[PDB]
Amino acid sequence: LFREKIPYVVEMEGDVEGMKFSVRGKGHGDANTGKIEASFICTTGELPVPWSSILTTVAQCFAKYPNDIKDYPKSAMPEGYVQERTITFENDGVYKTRAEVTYEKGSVYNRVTLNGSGFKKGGNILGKKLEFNYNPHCIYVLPDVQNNGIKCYINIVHDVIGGGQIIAAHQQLNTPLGGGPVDIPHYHHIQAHTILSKDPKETRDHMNVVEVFRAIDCKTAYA
Amino acid sequence: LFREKIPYVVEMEGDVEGMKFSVRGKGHGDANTGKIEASFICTTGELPVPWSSILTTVAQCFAKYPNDIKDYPKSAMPEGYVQERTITFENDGVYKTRAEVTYEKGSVYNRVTLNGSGFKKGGNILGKKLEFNYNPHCIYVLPDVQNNGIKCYINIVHDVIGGGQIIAAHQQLNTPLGGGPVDIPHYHHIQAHTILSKDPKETRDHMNVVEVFRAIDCKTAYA
């Protein structure tokens, strides 16, 4: 199912303090390498929040997994899985997100909704004061047998224009869309690395993305 | 002054919901390997909270640093540095801690105070329902030039007796005790690995620790 590089499609609807927007993305994921390359367009005009703020919201199934850690997202495929997050920004509001990640017609689809509230008028998010770049991160993956899934935790470091960084605290739940058996792993990490870029020839508000996700058995590797 | 294995001494005073306690530790740290081995005794009787809950509170200077990342804690030595943390436990209270980490008489000293409040009667902390073990973790180290130091973020995964895990969210600030020059690094990670043990011959409430800390230039290493 993930033996080859395969197409990745994203359909996102957002609403942040009443500002509605749509994002569409197309790219590929290669679970052999853990690499994602995708292009995102805001199809409703100007994105009303920083691109970096929605990077995590816009495919964990593409992560490079070794044989000796259960791969919950790939196990939930092809019927797929629900990915829910609360993202709380330092001194600012929260994104609540609900995604359905499915395998259809040789492609992975990430169809995701986002609501934002509690954001400050001239803060880093509504003021769009975050740099257009990204930092590498460590994703925590924990078993959640009670929910037939995994709970994940991430701190995201956002670089602020003119110096400084803020944290976006991520709480994440992945549960199955199917009725099939799922593989629920022991606690481990996913190393994340992300380069954001623009196409100079692209006139629409956009974000291009090159990502690497590698699962690490930290109980062994950090010893 | 970190070229050799050197002694490590810890003096901790705690107050959680009015329960006062003292912890003393002795061991060594080796910054060549990133290894800490130390023994902790509660000198006031029974520890009123889980040992694992105070593991992070009871020497980042011992972490194994490569040449290409600035080592803030070693740079602050020998006058040393202040380590402040807010630790907020899932569905439970918060530890506020202030440490002074110094080099005196051939030894690293961690003299640290802890206050706990907002804890639930019969919860995982006051009920001591956390397992006597520890998980590996990823420490985020960020520059904080405004404070002549570093800000660090950690999620700690605590295993609960009889199954389950909770998160202890760590916010950490390190500032100098001296007026000397300090080395403030770019954003990077410290991989942490910790094994807890008891001495069968020890009659006092106690915790022995073997730890490995390695700084990783994640901007490069995760690519």
Author numbering:
A (entry chain B), B (entry chain A): 7 to 64, 68 to 232
From the paper:
We were surprised to discover a second green-emitting FP in A. cf. australis, AausFP1, that shares only 53% amino acid identity with avGFP. AausFP1 is to our knowledge the brightest FP discovered to date, with a nearly perfect quantum yield (0.97) and a peak extinction coefficient of 170,000 M−1cm−1, making it nearly 5-fold brighter than EGFP on a per-molecule basis. These already extraordinary properties are further bolstered by a low fluorescence pKa (4.4), unusually narrow excitation and emission peaks, and higher photostability than mEGFP (see below). Despite low expression in its native context, wild-type AausFP1 expresses and folds very efficiently in E. coli at 37°C without any modifications. Though brightly fluorescent, AausFP1 is largely insoluble in this context, and when purified, the soluble fraction of the protein runs as a high-molecular-weight aggregate on size exclusion chromatography. X-ray crystallography revealed a uniquely stabilized chromophore environment in AausFP1 that may be responsible for its unique properties. Since AausFP1 crystallizes as a dimer, we speculate that it takes on this oligomeric state in its native context, perhaps stabilized by other interactions. It is possible that, as with other FPs such as dTomato, the dimer interface serves to stabilize the chromophore environment and may contribute to the unusually high brightness of AausFP1. AausFP1 photobleaches at similar rates to mEGFP on both widefield and confocal microscopy when instrument settings are identical, but because AausFP1 emits photons at a higher rate (due to its high quantum yield and extinction coefficient), its true photostability is somewhat higher than that of mEGFP (S1 Text and Figs Z and AA in S1 Text). AausFP1, the brightest fluorescent protein currently known, will serve as the parent of an entirely new lineage of super-bright FP variants.
